[PDB]
Amino acid sequence: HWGYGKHNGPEHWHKDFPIAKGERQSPVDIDTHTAKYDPSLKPLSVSYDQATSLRILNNGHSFQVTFDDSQDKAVLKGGPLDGTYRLIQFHFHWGSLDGQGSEHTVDKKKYAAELHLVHWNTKYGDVGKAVQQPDGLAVLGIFLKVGSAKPGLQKVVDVLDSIKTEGKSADFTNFDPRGLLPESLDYWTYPGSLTTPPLAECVTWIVLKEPISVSSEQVLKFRKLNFNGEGEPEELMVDNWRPAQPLKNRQIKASFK
Ligand SMILES: NS(=O)(=O)c1ccc(-c2cnc3ccccc3c2)cc1
Numbered sequence: 493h494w495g496y497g498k499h500n501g502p503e504h505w506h507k508d509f510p511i512a513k514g515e516r517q518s519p520v521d522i523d524t525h526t527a528k529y530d531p532s533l534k535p536l537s538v539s540y541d542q543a544t545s546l547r548i549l550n551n552g553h554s555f556q557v558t559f560d561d562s563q564d565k566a567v568l569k570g571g572p573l574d575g576t577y578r579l580i581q582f583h584f585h586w587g588s589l590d591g592q593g594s595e596h597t598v599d600k601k602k603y604a605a606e607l608h609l610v611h612w613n614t615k616y617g618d619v620g621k622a623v624q625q626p627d628g629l630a631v632l633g634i635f636l637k638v639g640s641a642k643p644g645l646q647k648v649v650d651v652l653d654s655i656k657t658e659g660k661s662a663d664f665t666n667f668d669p670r671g672l673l674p675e676s677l678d679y680w681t682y683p684g685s686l687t688t689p690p691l692a693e694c695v696t697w698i699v700l701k702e703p704i705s706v707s708s709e710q711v712l713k714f715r716k717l718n719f720n721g722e723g724e725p726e727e728l729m730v731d732n733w734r735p736a737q738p739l740k741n742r743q744i745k746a747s748f749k
């Protein structure tokens with residue numbers, strides 16, 4: 493099936509998911525001089541104080557932390573959004589080297605990794621229905637650069653040993669995702685897609701201007717995870733990112749001047 497290797501990677505996905513060549517695909521390059529400041533954009537509202545994490549899991553393409561989304565516990569509102577989006581999971585994309593790994597780029601610059609906090613629009617009732625709607629999901633994207641450690645990320649790094657291979661999961665309760673956010677909530681926003689199959693064009697992208705810094709030891713532990721399942725030939729989980737896609741008939745808006 494699909495992956496990130498030479499024979500099943502992003503250049504192959506369109507054969508099983510022809511929307512890969514669609515009109516609003518993600519990620520994209522964010523050209524900061526062409527993005528337009530939109531003074532009508534509201535401030536983001538990130539309400540994570542009641543977030544209830546459940547599990548952390550290696551799904552063979554990334555690792556993700558899942559949340560209880562059966563109530564309005566951790567929600568994203570405001571910014572470009574109408575209505576209320578519940579946090580379902582977060583995951584990362586990262587590189588084999590510090591100079592690559594992010595999916596979005598900024599003036600063609602690549603960051604060492606990118607964090608995706610995935611939310612879905614409660615008016616559609618469940619995430620499966622939301623992914624079939626043009627305004628069904630809202631993904632908050634946060635760049636990672638290598639520098640000082642991010643203390644709020646360390647509890648995630650600590651547990652990666654226990655989910656080395658595809659299919660492994662572990663308890664990951666009482667994790668506070670507010671510890672992954674940068675200081676500023678300034679953002680770029682554009683309509684796009686999931687960046688993995690099924691590549692559904694259901695995502696309002698909200699990409700934060702300010703990266704977070706993580707330490708080389710923290711990102712190194714990402715790179716020790718495995719694409720493969722236990723007992724199979726070891727393939728390190730690195731470079732699980734989709735490259736920038738054509739912007740086509742879209743404008744990126746900025747919340748800040
Ligand atoms: N990398 S990303 O754009 O943030 C991303 C990519 C794919 C998903 C995803 C995958 N499978 C799904 C199946 C059912 C419902 C929602 C899904 C979302 C969710 C998030």
Ligand SMILES: [Zn+2]
Nearest residue numbers: 583585608687
């Ligand atoms: Zn992602």
